[PDB]
Amino acid sequence: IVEGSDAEIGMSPWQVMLFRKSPQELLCGASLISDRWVLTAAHCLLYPPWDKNFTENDLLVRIGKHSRTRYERNIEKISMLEKIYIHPRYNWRENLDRDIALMKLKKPVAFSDYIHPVCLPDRETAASLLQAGYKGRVTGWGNLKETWTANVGKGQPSVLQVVNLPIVERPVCKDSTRIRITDNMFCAGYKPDEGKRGDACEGDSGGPFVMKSPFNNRWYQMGIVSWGEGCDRDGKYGFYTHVFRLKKWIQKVIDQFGE
């Protein structure tokens, strides 16, 4: 996260770390949506241009975390994956359309003060909240300074970072880029004049964009961190997978297995 701050403890108890077994690496963010299901971006697992294609045994999931690199001994939980599900029309050839994936855990996680699922939106929640100008919040352990062009200064955080960013309108999203934007994406971020800054960055992809409902005080995940051009470049924006539009796919797969 660029221009964010450190998270409070337990502030985002659905944040998950995607962790490669060998070498031990942070791969991506993710999120916990029930005791057994994790949501992330498909590009975290499957990306042919860069010869990326992870399977279940390549990875661990780590839940309950705050520190990026410590093993948080009686706080975090580490889980093995049972099954990865990628959207069957994810578009890695062109624009990362349908950048979504579900991971099934081997055994259910127990919840605690630090481990707690987020909600997925319903139609009326999506409708009321997903408006230009409304802010949501992005969290993660990825770089502090741009690496699309490697940046110095500080590099990597020690703790989970957080930033709040406004939804931007669709025409400005589309006029900021040469990529074909779909209805399965939204963008977010401050406009160059607005004075405030901030963005996701490498290592943040796959994590949550969440919003808090003013009607029932719950947190909903509206976006997944997907792609962007650089990090915190003026006149550019972050693009997020639109979680509600892909919700039928999500419930299709979690209903078909299955207890």
Binding site: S22, Q24, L26, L60, T69, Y71, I78, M80
Partner: peptide, 10 residues
Amino acid sequence: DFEEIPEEYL
């Protein structure tokens, strides 16, 4: 960079 995790997880 990462601290070592328990061998039961690998």
